[PDB]
Write a protein that binds this ligand. Structure first.
Ligand SMILES: Nc1ccc(S(=O)(=O)N(Cc2ccccc2)[C@H]2CNC[C@@H]2N(Cc2ccccc2)S(=O)(=O)c2ccc(N)cc2)cc1
Ligand SMILES: [Cl-]
Ligand SMILES: [Cl-]
Ligand SMILES: [Cl-]
Lengths: 99, 99
């Protein structure tokens, strides 16, 4: 697809057996989702932006589907106000900015 | 251009005759720059990041060049981690996400 930026670039994702809505975000180095359970080991991380920092849990090697496209990578989980697909996964689906 | 996302999509912008580095951020609704001087009157604006809402200065109808492409629109000024070009100006330069 070619996604317009007139509106937020929101897409459906599938992760952990769950369908969620998420923002395709080129400014985010990492993917960050609202509180959920994921399998496997994790370690704590801090991420931050305007408004300050939040503590999240870092899970590696997680499978996700984004708009039909399968990808694997690190997912951060924590008290984010919006589900974010970051560059670590956008690269895997071949997402580019074009103008 | 076509910009891949293996690294931060940092580009050069020009504003007030000064060159700056800014991030192309499809997750940001609004463009926000580090503290700087802009002409005219400003209005108050709240923006929300992962850690909460903060107050920034809103300047309307500001001339800005982004990677060689001209735009005129709203620019916010405040304590942002990095200069950010958000969707209000990415739309003006014709930017889309593609995969
Ligand atoms: N590693 C890492 C660091 C930060 C984040 S993030 O702050 O959640 N996050 C996602 C987001 C939050 C809130 C609303 C919409 C998107 C970043 C990326 N897009 C916007 C947001 N921000 C920019 C940023 C922060 C740190 C490093 C580089 C850029 S931000 O500061 O909250 C922001 C929010 C709204 C506007 N107008 C401008 C800026 C995610 C992963
Ligand atoms: Cl990763
Ligand atoms: Cl590539
Ligand atoms: Cl605008």
């Amino acid at each position: 697809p070619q996604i317009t930026l007139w509106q937020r670039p929101l897409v459906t994702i599938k992760i952990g057996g769950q369908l969620k809505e998420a923002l395709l975000d080129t400014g985010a180095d990492d993917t960050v989702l609202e509180e959920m359970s994921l399998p496997g080991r994790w370690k704590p991380k801090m991420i931050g932006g305007v408004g300050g920092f939040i503590k999240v849990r870092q899970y590696d090697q997680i499978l996700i589907e984004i708009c039909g496209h399968k990808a694997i990578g690190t997912v951060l989980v924590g008290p984010t106000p919006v589900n974010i697909i970051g560059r670590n996964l956008l690269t895997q689906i071949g997402c580019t900015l074009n103008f």
